[PDB]
Amino acid sequence: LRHTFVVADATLPDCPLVYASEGFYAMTGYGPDEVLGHNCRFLQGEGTDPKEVQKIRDAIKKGEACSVRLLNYRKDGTPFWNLLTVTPIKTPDGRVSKFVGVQVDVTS
Ligand SMILES: *[C@@]12=NC3=[C]C([C])=C([C])[C]=C3N([C][C]([O])[C]([O])[C]([O])[C]OP([O])([O])=O)C1=NC(=O)[N]C2=O
Numbered sequence: 001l002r003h004t005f006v007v008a009d010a011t012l013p014d015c016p017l018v019y020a021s022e023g024f025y026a027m028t029g030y031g032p033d034e035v036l037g038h039n040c041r042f043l044q045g046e047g048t049d050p051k052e053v054q055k056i057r058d059a060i061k062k063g064e065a066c067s068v069r070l071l072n073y074r075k076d077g078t079p080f081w082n083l084l085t086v087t088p089i090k091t092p093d094g095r096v097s098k099f100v101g102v103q104v105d106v107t108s
Contacts, residue, residue, distance in 0.1 A: 003023070004021050004023040004027050005024065006019065007098055007099070008039075009097075009099075010063075010099050015040075015099055020036070027105060028043060028075065030074075052070055055068050063090070067086075068084055069081065070082050070084055081107045082104070083103070
């Protein structure tokens with residue numbers, strides 16, 4: 001299937017993005033100049049279920065994996081449905097270093 005992929009840096013307190021696949025830019029309508037160094041939450045908007053947003057926020061603090069269905073918005077404002085799965089990446093000493101996320105547009 002069609003998917004995008006991003007990398008967040010968990011050694012920084014707010015998990016900024018540090019690498020995004022070609023499709024993530026092409027999908028969301030954002031450029032690296034507006035994406036790298038920012039938390040992925042810039043994709044959210046009015047109809048984004050605060051309950052699901054909390055499932056990922058909580059999962060990041062605990063360092064667990066997490067799969068949620070969110071309502072994101074492109075740069076032009078048009079909504080799309082994003083199936084997000086974040087995976088914690090730990091170092092040998094168990095601490096979390098990176099968060100990896102596959103995003104799928106399941107607007108169908
Ligand atoms: C976003 N993708 C995404 C990818 C990774 C690797 C991570 C760690 C998070 C996301 N998010 C969530 C966002 O960064 C944040 O964690 C949430 O907003 C919850 O935290 P707050 O502080 O806001 O309560 C993604 N969110 C999206 O909406 N779209 C994605 O593609």
